[PDB]
Design a protein around this ligand. Structure first.
Ligand SMILES: O[C@@H]1[C@@H](O)[C@@H](O)OC[C@H]1O
Length: 129
């Protein structure tokens, strides 16, 4: 599924991401935009053996288990294929864990590169929340 901007914002808000650990909703929508272009099936297979999965491109070394990545920690305790669902629940719950495990939103390069220091509110502006 390829989410719309406002549709994803609403879904992320229903799952409690707005202001989660001090990060406004627009930060999360912006991260998904530039990580995956809102595509729930996005994958990025890296040369280090790991793969980035789903709308928030969560990596298979630390966070999910795809069975083929060296050094797997599977800290979200989920198969990576679960992060490729049309429902964003698994990705949101793992994103929270990524932050709960001591990381900021710096854990998403696309967020640092394209969202940090910008008017992230624009990504929810005009939406029914
Ligand atoms: O485990 C849950 C976590 O994934 C998230 O949803 O935040 C609340 C917790 O109950």
């Amino acid at each position: 599924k390829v989410f719309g901007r406002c549709e994803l914002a609403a879904a992320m808000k229903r799952h409690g991401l707005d202001n989660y650990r001090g990060y406004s909703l627009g930060n999360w929508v912006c991260a998904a935009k530039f990580e995956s272009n809102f595509n729930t099936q996005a994958t990025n297979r890296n040369t280090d053996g790991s793969t980035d999965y789903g709308i928030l491109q969560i990596n298979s070394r630390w966070w999910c288990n795809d069975g083929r990545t060296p050094g797997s920690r599977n800290l979200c305790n989920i198969p990576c294929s679960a992060l490729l669902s049309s429902d964003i629940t698994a990705s949101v719950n793992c994103a929270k864990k990524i932050v709960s495990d001591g990381n900021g939103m710096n854990a998403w390069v696309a967020w640092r590169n394209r969202c940090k220091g910008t008017d992230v509110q624009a990504w929810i502006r005009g939406c029914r929340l």
